Each structure stands twice: as structure tokens, then as C-alpha cells.
Point group: D2
């Protein structure tokens, strides 16, 4: 049982802190920008002026913020995790940000004597509260062992991908497969329905062969049923595809399907679908075909 | 003497599919109009005739297995073809993977003779045809499907009726859109992972638990990591299958940007000497486009 | 100059004005009545009708074929009593249809076996250019055969160039069509970007015209895109057919042409929203549908 | 005639400032990062410690820096242009940066009482030295007319496209047409060469019709001749194409050819072409086709 700080107690963070206290850890919070939550402060938490103090007191310091700029700010701001990080302390970045930026952040955090782990989460609020998130970690094996039990308190599909920057690279690779697999099922079902066939029967038939995937089971069904209520919003997927495309431009990769998927997501947003589930990519292609795979 | 079945197309898959029907106790009838009857089929009891018509005149079911749309139109409606021998209670089953639109026209001409039609394209190659583990997607009349169901059970495993005539071919094309795009998705993500310094085997291992999980990630992903691209499903074949998809898209006004680009990447693979490579080798096209291999 | 005996197989939308300009220049026309009646105007102006393309070839020094598709070219060339049957030494067979460059090379070899010469002279400019003799003609063939037929090309067009080699005229036509479709798309994506950002597309076009972004497409199609003037000059269906030929060649010859591949998918959007018979400038309408935002009011 | 500050006296800024000095203007420089060029001081330019001081002195302050955050810095940094600017002063951003960032910078500078003009330039070191740059200006018509004699000293094709942000918007739109017209010629000449035609004769034939453009005339000849020495570097077009793609993601635009052009530029950089002239995009397509349009 260790002292744990958590910068970013929001939709996926507050829940994550909860399943950590639950495990028997003392959580420390920061009030430099936002106010300390109710179900955390009461269930055992200590409010602090800045993330530095939080880092100064806690052993493991976890960060969960929206994008790359927010990770850099909470880390190296005056009175930030860095100023309070020192030997035998471990910064765990659980946000999904630039892998290249991550490697530079890990290097600056090590200059204080502290260690760094990039542990982006693949799961969503269905894993955040239910403590069943997927976690991909980048860092040294010694440090990963220390934070290994902490991850178990918030998720189950935990993996060490490699050195610092490899956890963020793994999350981005997953996001490329997820977005492209959604587009693969979307294009195939639009073709099927344009040719007069029933997308649901094609899905059934295809789910038995090499077309089988978790995306065909879950998102394929949603595309046929028209259940596009948000679980993973298009905007969040636009942000993740932008990380992959910035990385590809920085490292000279020609990834044409990832590039196209981003433009299809833009059509979805142009028709009011920024807050639809990523499965709603079909409605962009449908708009692009002036034809729906659904009687609507 | 279970059923009298004819079979025009006894090649790399036709012959094993015909041998498997003979194992099930069926009476085979072959045409010698163009090619000589195989020795293993003749020794096992097949009866050779001159034209597909005599085959259709003798047999209750007539299976066709030829490489593309023009050869299906030929065996059906040439002089002394299947149509000129077809009639009431005879079932013409096209097992070729051809144009779903041309299929609809073929079916109506076969129904005009009093005969029934089933478009039942297969997925599984020579390995699945020999082992009778083929995926059969069927378009046609429900009674006609139930009549032919014990015959499909002797040549395949995952057998499903998708809908009316043409819907079987339509499901086959849709299957090939997903497989190709799923391969490109695994390839693009694994190229991005290796280019960012991560081990592509550990990224694949990590992604296989969550939403990015697929049969393509499991099988074709290993091929991309270990470098085993010896032909199983030639890129040349997938190019033909993707052309069927893109022709249908041009005819029915579909904007399918990822299918369109997959064909281009395949052309890069052929340009570098890979027409006969397994489709998993699509990665090598992207690797050539990035001047970077995820191996060696 | 030399007034030649010229046969013309294909008196349709493009052939008839083309055949009318050859007669204006002083040439003697020979038509075939094997499939169609000889146009009353072509006959009134001095044309002679013969029963089939063989008789036309036997009588004329040059034989032109202006037909829509590749099968029709093959038909009039090698059918019974076709052009090849009437062809021989000192006779020139000129295909001015736009068809496959790979099929063209084959037709020229079978035509030259007779001892006749073959030229592939696909044209660009449409009915109005054929009627105005302003068509651009890209020719593949022997330099001596090209100079022998140059006065005729000059009676039907203006920008006449020998690309050099049978098939190279059709190949140039396809390359011309790749550039026209992609230059339309480039102007369209740029003007959409400009208008979406609040800028006036007309002022952006004006600024861009005096620079490296300058093109005949930015000047003509760019104006159409800003004004909403998309009545067909050149239908999108026609350009889809042309891009299909380029994409067939890319697949056969192992070329990765992503922008040509994409422009065909965007043409499919325009058709899906009822635009098969719009001018190709209306590609912007497809991108506008994709952005759910029009660059016009 | 006027007092002019110039932040950014480099490959293009120095010849631009030299040309303004040539017109009888008083130049003011900043030494806060780099030493004020000797050639400028030797002609009457006054070196000051920071851009705040420069703005206090001059009536016009021109900024010529590489990207958006550099403009952001020289403007709103401590001792930057803003906290030295005020009524009757004109701030002119001659850099090629984000139109979105530009609109936000314009409103902050106008709050100082000063006026703002976004005046991006087209041309290289050659056009900057020869005063033949194309200038696209976004701002108030009076403010534009005031800077107009200054613009005429540095360039030839000057046009006011609209209010603030529109000059940068017109520059980004110009870079979309340039990169896409380069890809149009490269794709067409590759197709022609692969079919056996001489790219040179094709260009000659296409220059008299509707396919004719300044890119076919200049870059077309470079692609045919193999003259790919730096005029405009691909790295720089890559930066400009990213401004278009960021704006498309921000305003929900599906621009598939602009998106693909960036991918082709990354292939060019993977084969060592970041510093080639953007005409060398053909080398990427040639790699992707394993075939050159020139005699190797």
C-alpha cells in the first residue's frame, strides 16, 4: 500500500482514484486549477496547493489529462510534478498523448532522480469505473514492477510494451487499427446494402471467417441497428488519429488509410456527428454515397 | 446415389470439392467440352459427358467453379451450355466469386428455363477446399438453399444464406473488402509502432486483447512480424476481388476511399515483385513507401 | 495544298462536325452505309456513300474512325468488309476515338500487316471544339505518316502534336484527363478551404491566378465553381469513363496513383447526389457535400 | 519615408529589409535572439535590444518568422511587439502561418490600438532579392493602402484578399493548388512513361490545352529533366500542407487529395528528399511504382 497522487480526477480519473483508494492506498489531490471532488476527499484524500506538493508527498504520481499540452503543463509548470519529483518517486502518465513528446518528458523527469512510466489506457468509462481498462506501459521493468499493483486496481489487460514512449506508441497503434477496422466494416456494409443485400445477414455470414473482429461484432451491429449513442466520441478518435498522423509526418511514414479515415471523420463532424460513437463513421460514408444501410 | 451432381470447373478447388462430394456418396457428372476429366474423379465414379448441357440434363444440381464473370456467362449460356440443359427441379449453383450485378442477370435467365439458381461463392482456397472447411455465402430461394444444404455441408463448414440471388456474391465481395482493409490496418499500425521504436511483436501481443483484436491481427499480423509471406492468398487474387468491389462502387455511386487506396498499395507490392506474395505482404508495400522494414 | 480522298467512319456528335470541316478545307468525303444512312448534309456537300468500310478504305487515301468505345473501334477495323479488308500500301488508318493505349498498339500492328499505316489521334475539345476546329489532337505514329496527315488534322484542330509512337497519342489523352480531373480537384479543395475559413472564393481565385497556382482550370473551372455555372461542357460521366481507363492501366502496369484513385471516388459522390450530367467543374459540389458546406450562397 | 521594424532578417527577411532600405525607409532591428546583419547596419539600420523597442520607434513592424508559435512569441512575449505597440502603428505578419492563430493574434494587437495585416509571401530567396514576391493580404482596406508602397518595394503581385486571416487563408489555398498540381503532373507523366510514352512529348502535347498550368510548364520540365535542386523544399511544403490539414480538422473539411499529397511527401522524405524541390514529389510516386520516368 503506497501514497498515490492523481492529477486529473475527471470522467475517467475520479473513478480511477476511487478503485485505487478501494485497494487500500492513500490518494493526494491538487487544487491549483480545479476543486477537489466530494467522493474522494471524504473517502480518504488530501487537498494540496500544487502538483509539486502532491509529488513531494506521494510516491506514485499519476496524470490523466486531455492532450499533450496539458501533460507538459502539469509536469513542468512552476509548482508542477517536476519541482516535487525526486529519487524513489514515480510519475505515471496515464493520458493518451504524443509518443515523441513523451520521450522528452520522461528524460526531464529522470533529471530530478525520479522515474517515469507512460501508461495510456485503451478502455473507456466502461473500464474506468469498472476497473477493467486496458493498460499499455512504457518504461524500465524495475519501475513497472513497482506500479504493476496500482494498474491492477484500475484495469486488467496490462502489458509492458518497451522503454519510455512505447506505451503511447501502442495506444496510438490500437487507435489506428480501431479506426481503420470501423471504416473496413463501414465500406463493406455500404457496398452490401447498395447491392440490395441485408447488412445484418452479411455481418452474420462474415463473422465466421477471416473478416471476424471485435469491431465487426460490436460496431458492425451498431451500424446495422443505428445505435450510435456515444461510448467513444468521433472527436476523441479525431484527436488520436491526429497523434498517428503527426507521428507519421515527423518520422516519414506514408499511411494512406489512416489519412483518409481522418477526412471521413471530418465529414461525420460536418453533419453534426462529433459526439456520435466512432461506429457512426458509416453515416459519413453514407452521406458520401447519398444512401443509408438502414431504412430511415 | 444421394444426389446426381454436375460440376463444371474441376481445378485447384473444384477437384477437391468434387472429390469431397464423391466421399459423401454423390454421383458426379463432368463435361469434357474444353478440359479432360480428372483421373482421381473418374476412378472414384464420375461420369464424363460432352457438354455442360448433357451434365444439366442428367444431374439435379449443377455446380460451376470458374475464375471470373465472363467464364460463368460462357458455361451458362454458350451453345450446349448449362441453360440449354436446365429445367424444372434442376438447381444451377455458381460457386465462382464474380460480379453480384452480373449474377442477378444470370439467375433470371436460369429461372426462365424452369430451373433454380444459387450464387454460393466460397472463401478458403485450396487448403479449405481440400479440408472441406470452406466458408459458403449463399444467395437464392430458401427451399433451394435447404435442398442444396447437405451438398454445401460436404464441401464447407460456415454455410449461410445471405438473401435473394446476388446476395451471396455481394457478401463475398464485402468479405474481401474487410480482409484487405483489416490487413492494411494491422500493417499501418505495425509500421507506425516499429518506426516509433516499439517492438512490433509486443505491440501485436498487447493489442490482441482489446477492441483492435481480429483474426487478421492474429494470423496476418504474425506473418508481418515473422516475415512469412509465402503465397496462401496471392495479392494478384485480392486485386481481382478489390476490382469487383471498385467496379460496383463506380456503377452504384459509392465513395469507398480505403478500398480505392488498398488497390493502389497492392499495385506497389506487384511493382516490387510481389504479385504472388500472400496478402499479408501488403505491409511490404507500405514498408517500401516508408523506406523502413518492421523486421531484420 | 493536296485535296485527299478521305473516308470517315463515325458521323456522330464529334465525327459529323469533324467531317464537315474536312469538306470545308476542300477534301472529298467517303462514308459507309453498312450500319447507318449517310447524313443528308454530308451528301449535299459532296460526300460519296459506299456500302461498307472496305469499299471506303479501297477508295480513300485516309480512313478516319471517330467512334465512342474500344469494341466499336475493333469492329469497324476487322469485321467482314471492314477497314483492314480494304486497307493496303499508301493508305492511312487514323483512329480519332479515345480508347485503350494497349488495345491501340495491337490494332496498329494488324493494320500495318496489310501494308497500310496507322495513326492514333485522340482529340480533346468536345462538340464545340469539333464544330469550331479548335480540337487538340495528340498523335502516335510514324513521323512521315504524321506529316502526310498533318494538313487534315489542321482542318479539324489547333494544338496538334505527335507524341511519337502508336499508342502514345491515346496514352497522352489519358495523361491529359488525369491532369484535368486532378487540377479540377485541386482548385475545388483549395476554394472549399478558403470559403470555409470565411474568405471570398472569388478574391482568393484572383490572388492565386497571378502565380504558381495559375492554370487554365483555375481560370475557367475556378470561375464556374465560384459562379455556380455547372451546365455540361464536359459531363462527369465522361470523366469517370476516362479515369476508369487510367485506373485500369495503373492496375495492369503496377502504378500507385492515389490522387487519380481518389478523384474517381469523389466523382462517384457527385453522381450519387444526381450529378452524372454536370460539368466536371461541379466536382466542388461533391466536396461541398462531403464538408456539408457550399462555397456559394 | 517611413520608420520600419523588421523581426526576422533571414534568407528572405534580409533581402526584403534591404529592399525597403533601398526605397529610402528607416530600418530598426532586434538583437534579442540573433545579431543584426552587418549588411543592414552598414546601410543605416538601427539595432535595438528587443521587438518592444522596435515597435515603440517604427510606424510599421514586419514579422518574418518560420511558424505560428514563433509569430506568437515575437508578438506576445515579454518585451515583444504587442507591449510596445499602439495607435497608428501597423503590425504586418509576412510569415506563412495558421489562419486561425492569425485571427486571434489580430484581435489582441488591435486591442493595443494598433492595426494588423497578415501579408504572407510566395517566392524564394530569388523573388525576395528581386522584389518579385507575391503578397496576399488580410486586413482593413486603409491599413492595406498604407503598407501598399512597402509591399511594392518587396514584391510584384500584391492583392488584398479580405479581412484579417484571409491573407494566410489565401496562402494556404495557394499551397494546396501548388502541391496538388505537382501531384497531378507527376501522376500523369508517370502513367505516360510506364505506357512507353516520352514524358517530354506528353508535356509538350498537354501544354496547349486544358491541362496547361505554370506547374506543367516549370515543374513538369524539372520532372522530365531531373532538375530537383532546391527552389522550394518539400519540408517547407509539408509544413504548409499541415496548415491546410489542421484547418480542415478544425472546420470539418474532407479534402482527400490534400490529405494524400502529405503522405506522398512523407515517402519523398523517407527516401532522403526533404530538401529536394517540391517537383521531386514524382520521385515518391516513382518509388511507389518501382519505376522512374527518366533514363536511370
Amino acid at each position: 500500500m503506497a501514497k498515490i497522487g492523481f492529477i486529473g480526477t475527471g470522467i475517467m480519473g475520479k473513478p480511477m482514484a476511487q478503485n485505487l483508494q478501494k485497494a487500500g492506498h492513500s490518494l493526494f489531490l491538487s487544487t491549483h486549477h480545479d476543486a477537489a471532488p466530494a467522493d474522494l476527499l471524504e473517502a480518504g484524500a488530501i487537498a494540496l496547493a500544487n502538483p509539486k506538493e502532491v509529488a513531494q508527498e506521494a510516491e506514485f504520481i499519476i496524470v490523466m489529462v486531455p492532450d499533450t499540452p496539458q501533460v507538459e503543463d502539469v509536469l513542468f509548470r512552476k509548482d508542477g510534478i517536476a519541482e516535487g519529483a525526486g529519487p524513489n518517486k514515480v510519475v505515471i502518465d496515464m493520458s493518451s498523448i504524443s509518443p515523441t513528446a513523451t520521450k522528452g518528458f520522461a528524460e526531464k523527469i529522470k533529471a530530478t532522480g525520479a522515474q517515469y512510466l507512460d501508461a495510456p489506457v485503451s478502455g473507456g468509462e466502461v473500464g474506468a469505473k469498472a476497473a477493467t481498462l486496458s493498460i499499455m506501459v512504457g518504461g524500465c521493468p524495475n519501475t513497472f514492477e513497482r506500479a504493476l499493483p496500482l494498474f491492477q486496481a484500475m484495469g486488467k489487460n496490462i502489458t509492458r510494451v518497451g522503454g519510455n514512449g512505447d506505451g503511447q506508441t501502442a495506444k496510438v497503434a490500437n487507435q489506428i487499427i480501431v479506426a481503420l477496422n470501423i471504416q473496413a466494416v463501414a465500406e463493406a456494409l455500404l457496398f452490401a446494402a447498395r447491392n440490395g443485400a441485408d447488412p445484418a445477414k452479411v455481418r452474420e455470414a462474415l463473422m465466421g471467417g477471416f473478416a471476424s473482429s471485435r469491431i465487426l461484432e460490436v460496431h458492425g451491429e451498431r451500424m446495422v441497428k443505428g445505435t450510435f449513442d456515444p461510448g467513444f466520441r468521433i472527436s476523441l478518435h479525431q484527436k488520436d488519429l491526429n497523434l498517428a498522423l503527426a507521428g507519421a509526418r515527423e518520422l516519414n511514414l506514408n499511411l494512406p488509410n489512416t489519412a483518409n479515415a481522418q477526412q471521413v471523420f471530418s465529414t461525420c463532424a460536418a453533419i453534426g456527428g462529433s459526439n456520435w460513437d466512432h461506429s457512426a463513421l458509416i453515416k459519413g460514408l453514407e452521406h458520401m454515397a447519398n444512401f443509408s444501410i438502414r431504412d430511415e
